[PDB]
């Protein structure tokens, strides 16, 4: 659960990423899609080497929505609930793929914003992301 | 009446809090369910406790205990006491206990405004101080009416009053008010539509600023480039040097500034560089010019200073 | 002689076993059943607690068709309580009980596979988030597999810490390898109503779930919060009993089925279908 | 499976530069400040509460330092890993009972630690390598 | 009463068998709850039969007839009889009889080593009698130092020890004997510390071997590449041809191994062939070692043998 310190950590966090975020996305779908090649079964349509303008566009689509969430972090199942919906029911993704992109986000943040990526913002960010994923993961069935 | 007696808790001081009624000697609330500042104004005058600073309504005191008392109370303001008003009866409501209605009030919040930090007695970090204790405020939804009815309540220029703490670093301790949603006119920034005092997700690096200024000392310029009309944008506010952040910085900004500085249009948003420029940590920060304005002061919400132009470079021009 | 049959077990019989006539009833010749919920030994999914000891042998693995393992709880030696949303995974809203079982694979014990005769949900399964399974034949009850038993009191009062064991995802949202559990303490009734919907009065109930989807809430529903660890029950941990020891007469009672899993970490509260209020249905439905 | 002569390159280049008496502890440290279950298993340990006392622990620095010495005896055995970790397996397994998605937890933070040490020099590439390192180490390290 | 008379039944001597203790004038067992290695110490020092070789409560040893006494003990190791842990109680037990725990001390022990299936009598796959059956070790954990406690026991020259079965076959049989932790200065292999006897996560793939030797047979020389230092690893251990695999062989082994014929370091772990050579079943592994070593025998941990080198490829060299 994000306390108002976690949303006050993720918050800052992610206005420092700022105008990095559709790049910080699209490092984090190539590490996703290098460490863990599994995940690569839900874009069979995608240009998946590196530098991919496809996958920077992702990247970017995805960025956008995490800055969202960051906005509407006391509202994210509303502002997920497209997301959701898609992920959940038209993509199937399931779960697990959800928390290795997590797991990448963190890696490319704490590659990007050394100095910003402390324990307590790690675990926060931690949190927001799994928030995130929950959102996403729940109408799966 | 007469045995009634209400109090309000977990409030900070005596004058804020939950509103708390004894009937039948048992404490009980009273539904956020048609309350505005009618009621709180009724509530605050009742006790003692002056004006009424604010009312709020979803149990952010904390949730109450016991018996809801009133859920749907009429007041029209000038009522002796809480306990007058219509509603619909004593006990009667279709509440929780998430929606206990709360107060503060204005011998209790005491509030005042300053700026701090600034390049002027009328720039820099806008802080408030909400129950004895100074605090900032959160940038987000800070924007030029907040800033117009900032600069007429500390009392000086609302000719030009731009956002952003000039140059003033963070400031410590509270962040009081977030979203203050002035329209322009009210009397003082705690009468505007804002959140709940201190419910925020803000850091201190966000913190609210303006520049109040009567229109006569803000100078912008050109150097760099050779000529009066090409070259790195530079910005004088209240003499404090800076250049434009060119984030969102096209050719209709571009154009505003040719224009304020009297060169036609914007041909070019960079320059063939004649001479160095001295190094300016503060920055200015436009938001979204139409293209028509007049100056570049004229274009909705210029911060000028309270953000970082780290991975974007100075706004650079070739007028004609 | 004297019937007796071997541990785990308690004879089921009305006088003793000395016998083939009997002098209490005659040629009954009793069998013996299983023993409600004393786990040979007992214990003392997000988190932790791995379930080293099989301090759980009541929780049963359920893998639907399309492998999305849940949860299922032994109650007697046949029979198994799980959720309706269990069931119903990989099948249409209109899907009957009769070809749902056919598409289960259930688990008991270590991986001990047992086929499912026939299922049947909850006459208000969407009230009552709740579906029997029952067993081919009864499971050989032994110190991996055991009922847990149906409760005589209501456990579910505020503070009560029962145990959840799940198969369920864990913190990597992966399908947990061993069963593991967590110590979760049920909440407040009204801060959970309040947690999921509006403000606990059906006229300002809203979907406020810190989750996309929202709990079943009702009067046959209890809330348990994460534990002090921060740590929750998460997706597959559905019809895992909310297991309390009852330390008077060293028992383990199914207090609540967990139907809304769904509540990872996010959402504060997991909601449990009471078992008491069920009881009555689950008891009519294994004497047919 | 067998990693390519170019990821073991990779693994062995940055763990070179890997400060071993700090990297460990910083893991260790963020694995209970991020995932606060696995400070069950550190009662021991003394004030794990506040992130800064943990981050802040001698024990937890002691023993993430006993961890990552753990890490680079897997790491020069990267082809027997089973092996070399059948006694910490055991140990984890029995007298300790953690979980095995905990091992997996504390790589991926370990991964996070080593990308925060080392920015662009963690490249998806040998962020790669490092994944499957951690999935070699927590696989043999559990069950 | 302090006058509990304890026995083991059914385990072939006095020192091994099911526990069995009389109290109240009949003769009962206990159960295997929470049974390890301290209980059985407990047991092993109550009839002055040594150390605790192993426990055991599958009744191994036979099933038990009587009151199970003792069902759930804390043994920490030192106490002076098994009536002094947390019993949990006397009589009261949640076991049957085929939950007995029976014990195997180090008097009453038949244990033993032997080597089989090698080149020579100091070689082969290393088998340890328990209960006089005859099993495997698993090389979990089996390294040079047990090789040297296990070369030291069984007594022939012990200057080289290796690990690894040399040409041997999959043991059959049980795997007695798991992930050993000798620190090279026990007696035997059962004194250093391990799994519990018979428990193991292998399979006799795995059979765990050595190889003793004063080192004067062990030769290693390079074929198939005209020059003497260059082609592939052949060796020679106790005249048995075999071949370095190159898992873990990098350039640091491959001048290692160049240093021992004496060719300066190594250029690449590939050569030009010169000569076609054959195919031996056997293989060298070494799992690391520093480099600066000057022989490829003296550098830690090289396993002889027990191994297929099929996912992998045979080990080249061309030193200079
Ligand atoms: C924090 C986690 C995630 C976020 C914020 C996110 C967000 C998004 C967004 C914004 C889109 C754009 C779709 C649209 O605009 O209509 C998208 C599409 C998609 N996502 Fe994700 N996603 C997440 C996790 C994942 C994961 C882990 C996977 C797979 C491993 C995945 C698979 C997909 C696929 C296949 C698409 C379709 C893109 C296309 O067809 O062009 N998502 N996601
Ligand atoms: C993932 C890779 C891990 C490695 C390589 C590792 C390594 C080690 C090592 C070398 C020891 C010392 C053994 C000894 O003292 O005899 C140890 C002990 C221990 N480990 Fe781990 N560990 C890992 C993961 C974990 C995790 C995730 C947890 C808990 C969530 C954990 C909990 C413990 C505890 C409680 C001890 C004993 C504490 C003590 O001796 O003071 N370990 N581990
Ligand atoms: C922002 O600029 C103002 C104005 O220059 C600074 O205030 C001055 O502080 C210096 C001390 O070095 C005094 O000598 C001046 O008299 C001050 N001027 C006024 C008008 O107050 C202020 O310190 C700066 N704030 C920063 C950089 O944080
Ligand atoms: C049960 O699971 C199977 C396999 O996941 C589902 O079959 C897939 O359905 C989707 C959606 O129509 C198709 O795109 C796939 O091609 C199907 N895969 C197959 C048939 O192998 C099936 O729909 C699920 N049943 C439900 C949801 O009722
Ligand atoms: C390992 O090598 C030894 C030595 O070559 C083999 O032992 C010989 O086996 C043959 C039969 O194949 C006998 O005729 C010899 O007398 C044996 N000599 C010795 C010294 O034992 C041994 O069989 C091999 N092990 C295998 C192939 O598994
Ligand atoms: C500039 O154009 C906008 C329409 O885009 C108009 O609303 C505004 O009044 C114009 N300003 C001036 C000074 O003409
Ligand atoms: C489920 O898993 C089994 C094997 O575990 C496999 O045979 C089957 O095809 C899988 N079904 C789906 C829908 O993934
Ligand atoms: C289903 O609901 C009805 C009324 O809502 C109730 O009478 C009935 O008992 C419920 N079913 C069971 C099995 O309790
Ligand atoms: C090789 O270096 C190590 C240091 O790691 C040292 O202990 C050893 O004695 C050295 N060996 C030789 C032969 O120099
Ligand atoms: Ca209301
Ligand atoms: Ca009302
Ligand atoms: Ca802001
Ligand atoms: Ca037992
Ligand atoms: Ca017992
Ligand atoms: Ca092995």
Same mark, same amino acid.
């Given at each position: 659960? @994000?306390?108002?310190?976690?949303?006050?950590?993720?918050?800052?966090?992610?206005?420092?990423?700022?105008?990095?975020?559709?790049?910080?996305?699209?490092?984090?779908?190539?590490?996703?899609?290098?460490?863990?090649?599994?995940?690569?079964?839900?874009?069979?349509?995608?240009?998946?080497?590196?530098?991919?303008?496809?996958?920077?566009?992702?990247?970017?689509?995805?960025?956008?929505?995490?800055?969202?969430?960051?906005?509407?972090?006391?509202? !994210?199942?509303?502002?997920?609930?497209?997301?959701?919906?898609?992920?959940?029911?038209?993509?199937?993704?399931?779960?697990?793929?959800?928390?290795?992109?997590?797991?990448?986000?963190?890696?490319?943040?704490?590659?990007?914003?050394?100095?910003?990526?402390?324990?307590?913002?790690?675990?926060?960010?931690?949190?927001?992301?799994?928030?995130?994923?929950?959102?996403?993961?729940?109408?799966?069935? | 009446?007469?045995?009634?007696?209400?109090?309000?808790?977990?409030?900070?001081?005596?004058?804020?809090?939950?509103?708390?009624?004894?009937?039948?000697?048992?404490?009980?609330?009273?539904?956020?369910?048609?309350?505005?500042?009618?009621?709180?104004?009724?509530?605050?005058?009742?006790?003692?406790?002056?004006?009424?600073?604010?009312?709020?309504?979803?149990?952010?005191?904390?949730?109450?205990?016991?018996?809801?008392?009133?859920?749907?109370?009429?007041?029209?303001?000038?009522?002796?006491?809480?306990?007058?008003?219509?509603?619909?009866?004593?006990?009667?409501?279709?509440?929780?206990?998430?929606?206990?209605?709360?107060?503060?009030?204005?011998?209790?919040?005491?509030?005042?405004?300053? @700026?701090?930090?600034?390049?002027?007695?009328?720039?820099?970090?806008?802080?408030?101080?909400?129950?004895?204790?100074?605090?900032?405020?959160?940038?987000?939804?800070?924007?030029?009416?907040?800033?117009?009815?900032?600069?007429?309540?500390?009392?000086?220029?609302?000719?030009?009053?731009?956002?952003?703490?000039?140059?003033?670093?963070?400031?410590?301790?509270?962040?009081?008010?977030?979203?203050?949603?002035?329209?322009?006119?009210?009397?003082?920034?705690?009468?505007?539509?804002?959140?709940?005092?201190?419910?925020?997700?803000?850091?201190?690096?966000?913190?609210?600023?303006?520049?109040?200024?009567?229109?006569?000392?803000?100078?912008?310029? @050109?150097?760099?480039?050779?000529?009066?009309?090409?070259?790195?944008?530079?910005?004088?506010?209240?003499?404090?040097?800076?250049?434009?952040?060119?984030?969102?910085?096209?050719?209709?900004?571009?154009?505003?500034?040719?224009?304020?500085?009297?060169?036609?249009?914007?041909?070019?948003?960079?320059?063939?560089?004649?001479?160095?420029?001295?190094?300016?940590?503060?920055?200015?920060?436009?938001?979204?010019?139409?293209?028509?304005?007049?100056?570049?002061?004229?274009?909705?919400?210029?911060?000028?200073?309270? @953000?970082?132009?780290?991975?974007?470079?100075?706004?650079?021009?070739?007028?004609? | 002689?004297?019937?007796?049959?071997?541990?785990?077990?308690?004879?089921?019989?009305?006088?003793?076993?000395?016998?083939?006539?009997?002098?209490?009833?005659?040629?009954?010749?009793?069998?013996?059943?299983?023993?409600?919920?004393?786990?040979?030994?007992?214990?003392?999914?997000?988190?932790?607690?791995?379930?080293?000891?099989?301090?759980?042998?009541?929780?049963?693995?359920?893998?639907?068709?399309?492998?999305?393992?849940?949860?299922?709880?032994?109650?007697?030696?046949?029979?198994?309580?799980?959720?309706?949303?269990?069931?119903?995974?990989?099948?249409?809203?209109?899907?009957?009980?009769?070809?749902?079982?056919?598409?289960?694979?259930?688990?008991?014990?270590?991986?001990?596979?047992?086929?499912?005769?026939?299922?049947?949900?909850?006459?208000?399964?969407?009230?009552?988030?709740?579906?029997?399974?029952?067993?081919?034949?009864?499971?050989?009850?032994?110190?991996?597999?055991?009922?847990?038993?149906?409760?005589?009191?209501?456990?579910?009062?505020?503070?009560?810490?029962?145990?959840?064991?799940?198969?369920?995802?864990?913190?990597?949202?992966?399908?947990?390898?061993?069963?593991?559990?967590?110590?979760?303490?049920?909440?407040?009734?009204?801060?959970?109503?309040?947690?999921?919907?509006?403000?606990?009065?059906?006229?300002?109930?809203?979907?406020?779930?810190?989750?996309?989807?929202?709990?079943?809430?009702?009067?046959?529903?209890?809330?348990?919060? !994460?534990?002090?660890?921060?740590?929750?029950?998460?997706?597959?941990?559905?019809?895992?009993?909310?297991?309390?020891?009852?330390?008077?007469?060293?028992?383990?009672?199914?207090?609540?089925?967990?139907?809304?899993?769904?509540?990872?970490?996010?959402?504060?509260?997991?909601?449990?279908?009471?078992?008491?209020?069920?009881?009555?249905?689950?008891?009519?439905?294994?004497?047919? | 499976?067998?990693?390519?002569?170019?990821?073991?390159?990779?693994?062995?280049?940055?763990?070179?530069?890997?400060?071993?008496?700090?990297?460990?502890?910083?893991?260790?440290?963020?694995?209970?400040?991020?995932?606060?279950?696995?400070?069950?298993?550190?009662?021991?340990?003394?004030?794990?509460?506040?992130?800064?006392?943990?981050?802040?622990?001698?024990?937890?620095?002691?023993?993430?330092?006993?961890?990552?010495?753990?890490?680079?005896?897997?790491?020069?055995?990267?082809?027997?890993?089973?092996?070399?970790?059948?006694?910490?397996?055991?140990?984890?397994?029995?007298?300790?009972?953690?979980?095995?998605?905990?091992?997996?937890?504390?790589?991926?933070?370990?991964?996070?630690?080593?990308?925060?040490?080392?920015?662009?020099?963690?490249?998806?590439?040998?962020?790669?390598?490092?994944?499957?390192?951690?999935?070699?180490?927590?696989?043999?390290?559990?069950?």
């Amino acid at each position: 659960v @994000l306390s108002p310190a976690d949303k006050t950590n993720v918050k800052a966090a992610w206005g420092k990423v700022g105008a990095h975020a559709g790049e910080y996305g699209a490092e984090a779908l190539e590490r996703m899609f290098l460490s863990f090649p599994t995940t690569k079964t839900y874009f069979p349509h995608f240009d998946l080497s590196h530098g991919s303008a496809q996958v920077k566009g992702h990247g970017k689509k995805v960025a956008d929505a995490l800055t969202n969430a960051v906005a509407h972090v006391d509202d !994210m199942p509303n502002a997920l609930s497209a997301l959701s919906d898609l992920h959940a029911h038209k993509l199937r993704v399931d779960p697990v793929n959800f928390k290795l992109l997590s797991h990448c986000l963190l890696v490319t943040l704490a590659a990007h914003l050394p100095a910003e990526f402390t324990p307590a913002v790690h675990a926060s960010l931690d949190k927001f992301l799994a928030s995130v994923s929950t959102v996403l993961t729940s109408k799966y069935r | 009446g007469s045995n009634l007696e209400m109090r309000l808790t977990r409030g900070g001081n005596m004058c804020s809090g939950r509103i708390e009624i004894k009937f039948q000697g048992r404490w009980g609330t009273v539904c956020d369910d048609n309350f505005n500042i009618d009621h709180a104004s009724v509530i605050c005058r009742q006790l003692e406790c002056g004006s009424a600073v604010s009312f709020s309504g979803s149990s952010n005191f904390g949730e109450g205990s016991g018996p809801i008392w009133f859920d749907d109370l009429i007041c029209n303001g000038n009522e002796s006491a809480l306990w007058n008003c219509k509603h619909q009866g004593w006990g009667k409501h279709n509440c929780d206990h998430a929606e206990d209605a709360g107060v503060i009030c204005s011998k209790g919040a005491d509030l005042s405004l300053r @700026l701090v930090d600034g390049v002027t007695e009328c720039s820099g970090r806008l802080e408030v101080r909400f129950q004895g204790e100074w605090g900032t405020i959160c940038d987000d939804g800070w924007d030029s009416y907040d800033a117009a009815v900032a600069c007429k309540q500390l009392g000086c220029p609302t000719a030009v009053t731009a956002i952003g703490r000039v140059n003033a670093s963070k400031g410590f301790g509270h962040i009081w008010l977030d979203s203050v949603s002035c329209q322009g006119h009210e009397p003082a920034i705690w009468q505007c539509k804002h959140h709940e005092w201190g419910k925020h997700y803000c850091n201190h690096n966000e913190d609210a600023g303006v520049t109040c200024s009567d229109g006569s000392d803000l100078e912008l310029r @050109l150097r760099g480039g050779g000529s009066r009309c090409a070259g790195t944008v530079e910005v004088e506010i209240q003499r404090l040097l800076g250049k434009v952040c060119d984030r969102g910085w096209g050719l209709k900004e571009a154009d505003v500034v040719c224009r304020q500085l009297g060169c036609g249009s914007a041909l070019k948003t960079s320059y063939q560089v004649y001479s160095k420029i001295q190094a300016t940590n503060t920055w200015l920060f436009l938001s979204s010019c139409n293209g028509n304005e007049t100056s570049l002061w004229d274009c909705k919400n210029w911060q000028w200073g309270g @953000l970082t132009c780290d991975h974007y470079e100075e706004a650079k021009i070739t007028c004609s | 002689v004297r019937y007796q049959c071997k541990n785990y077990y308690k004879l089921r019989t009305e006088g003793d076993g000395v016998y083939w006539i009997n002098k209490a009833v005659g040629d009954k010749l009793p069998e013996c059943e299983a023993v409600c919920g004393k786990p040979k030994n007992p214990a003392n999914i997000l988190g932790g607690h791995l379930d080293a000891k099989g301090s759980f042998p009541w929780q049963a693995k359920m893998v639907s068709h399309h492998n999305l393992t849940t949860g299922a709880t032994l109650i007697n030696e046949q029979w198994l309580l799980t959720t309706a949303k269990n069931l119903f995974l990989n099948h249409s809203e209109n899907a009957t009980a009769k070809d749902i079982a056919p598409t289960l694979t259930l688990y008991v014990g270590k991986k001990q596979l047992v086929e499912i005769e026939k299922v049947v949900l909850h006459p208000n399964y969407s009230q009552v988030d709740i579906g029997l399974i029952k067993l081919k034949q009864k499971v050989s009850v032994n110190e991996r597999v055991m009922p847990i038993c149906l409760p005589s009191k209501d456990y579910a009062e505020v503070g009560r810490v029962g145990y959840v064991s799940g198969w369920g995802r864990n913190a990597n949202f992966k399908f947990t390898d061993h069963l593991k559990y967590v110590m979760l303490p049920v909440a407040d009734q009204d801060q959970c109503i309040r947690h999921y919907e509006g403000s606990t009065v059906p006229e300002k109930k809203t979907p406020k779930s810190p989750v996309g989807v929202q709990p079943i809430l009702n009067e046959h529903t209890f809330c348990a919060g !994460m534990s002090k660890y921060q740590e929750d029950t998460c997706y597959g941990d559905a019809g895992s009993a909310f297991a309390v020891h009852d330390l008077e007469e060293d028992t383990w009672y199914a207090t609540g089925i967990l139907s809304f899993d769904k509540s990872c970490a996010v959402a504060e509260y997991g909601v449990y279908v009471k078992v008491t209020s069920i009881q009555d249905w689950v008891q009519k439905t294994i004497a047919e | 499976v067998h990693l390519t002569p170019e990821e073991k390159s990779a693994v062995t280049a940055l763990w070179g530069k890997v400060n071993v008496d700090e990297v460990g502890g910083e893991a260790l440290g963020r694995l209970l400040v991020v995932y606060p279950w696995t400070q069950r298993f550190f009662e021991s340990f003394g004030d794990l509460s506040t992130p800064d006392a943990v981050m802040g622990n001698p024990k937890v620095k002691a023993h993430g330092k006993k961890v990552l010495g753990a890490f680079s005896d897997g790491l020069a055995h990267l082809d027997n890993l089973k092996g070399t970790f059948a006694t910490l397996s055991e140990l984890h397994c029995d007298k300790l009972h953690v979980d095995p998605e905990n091992f997996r937890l504390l790589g991926n933070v370990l991964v996070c630690v080593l990308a925060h040490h080392f920015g662009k020099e963690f490249t998806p590439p040998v962020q790669a390598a490092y994944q499957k390192v951690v999935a070699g180490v927590a696989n043999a390290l559990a069950h």
